[PDB]
Each structure stands twice: as structure tokens, then as C-alpha cells.
């Protein structure tokens, strides 16, 4: 309510994209033919749960 902001999470359009974006974004398949992916950018990134 202060920044009037929000954050994404780890989400994508395919399970194929969800698999290779696992262990982090060192090799994140961020985009593909029509598909896409969002790596989590958040105060909650880097944590477990």
C-alpha cells in the first residue's frame, strides 16, 4: 500500500518451461515460439517456500 506495487512469481505457459526453470535462472528458458516465462523477481526470491 506504500509503493502501490506488486510482484511476480515463478510462472510460465508450459510445464516444459517450468522444468528447465528449476534450480534457478542460470539457464532459464525465458521465451519460446509463442510461449513465455517469468522468473520470480521479489523480496521472496532466494528463499525456499
Amino acid at each position: 500500500g506504500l509503493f502501490q506495487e506488486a510482484y511476480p512469481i515463478t510462472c510460465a505457459s508450459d510445464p516444459a518451461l517450468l522444468r528447465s526453470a528449476r534450480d534457478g535462472e542460470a539457464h532459464a528458458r525465458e521465451t519460446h515460439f509463442t510461449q513465455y516465462l517469468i522468473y520470480d523477481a521479489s523480496p521472496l526470491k532466494g528463499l525456499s517456500l
Binding site: 506488486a6 510482484y7 511476480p8 512469481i9 515463478t10 510462472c11 510460465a12 505457459s13 508450459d14 510445464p15 516444459a16 518451461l17 517450468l18 528458458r29 521465451t31 519460446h32 515460439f33 509463442t34 510461449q35 513465455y36 517469468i38 521479489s42 523480496p43 521472496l44
Partner: protein, 49 residues
């Protein structure tokens, strides 16, 4: 000394890849069985998280 951090989250759903990012990053990858349509070529409606 315990409490709540409330964070709203944003997920774009069913949007579409822009005109530049429609590549594959390698030739042979995300390939179907040879009698199958490769469903990654149409606009996505699914979402995974």
C-alpha cells in the same frame, strides 16, 4: 514479534509473445513425436505455477 507481510501478486495470463522473441535458441528442442502438431505454436491459454 510475529506478524504478517501481505504482498499482492501479478500474473499475466493468456497474453502473447511480441514480434521479436519467437525463436527457439537451438534447432532441435521442444520437438513433438513426428505425427503431432507441436502445440507450442499457438497462443497459450494455460498457466503454471
Amino acid at each position: 514479534l510475529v506478524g504478517a507481510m501481505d504482498l499482492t501478486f501479478v500474473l499475466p495470463l493468456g497474453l502473447f509473445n511480441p514480434a521479436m522473441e519467437r525463436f527457439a535458441a537451438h534447432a532441435g528442442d521442444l520437438v513433438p513425436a513426428p505425427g503431432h502438431p507441436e502445440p507450442r505454436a499457438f497462443p497459450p491459454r494455460q498457466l503454471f505455477f
